[PDB]
Amino acid sequence: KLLYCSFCGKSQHEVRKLIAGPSVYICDECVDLCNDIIREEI
Amino acid sequence: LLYCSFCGKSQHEVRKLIAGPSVYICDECVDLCNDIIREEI
Numbered sequence A: 001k002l003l004y005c006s007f008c009g010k011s012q013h014e015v016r017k018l019i020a021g022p023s024v025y026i027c028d029e030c031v032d033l034c035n036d037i038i039r040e041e042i
Numbered sequence B: 001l002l003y004c005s006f007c008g009k010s011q012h013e014v015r016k017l018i019a020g021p022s023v024y025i026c027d028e029c030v031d032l033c034n035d036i037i038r039e040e041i
């Protein structure tokens, strides 16, 4: 039942949303991080 | 080569590949994540 974000290791119970990939996951928190990285801004 | 773990595109076919412990996500998939999270197109 436990699913984990592949980037930070948090479970679905720890984040607001966990997005599925083939055999991976990424949570809303890491997405925020990806946006800063792509947009090169804080 | 390194590939986005979500769409499968290589590091040669995308603008940026972000790395995790042993996973990657490209700029294109991140855009899809923003749509998913913001529930908007």
Ligand SMILES: [Zn+2]
Pocket (backbone or CB within 6 Å): A005, A006, A007, A008, A009, A010, A026, A027, A028, A029, A030
């Ligand atoms: Zn995460």
Ligand SMILES: [Zn+2]
Pocket (backbone or CB within 6 Å): B004, B005, B006, B007, B008, B009, B025, B026, B027, B028, B029, B030
């Ligand atoms: Zn991708």
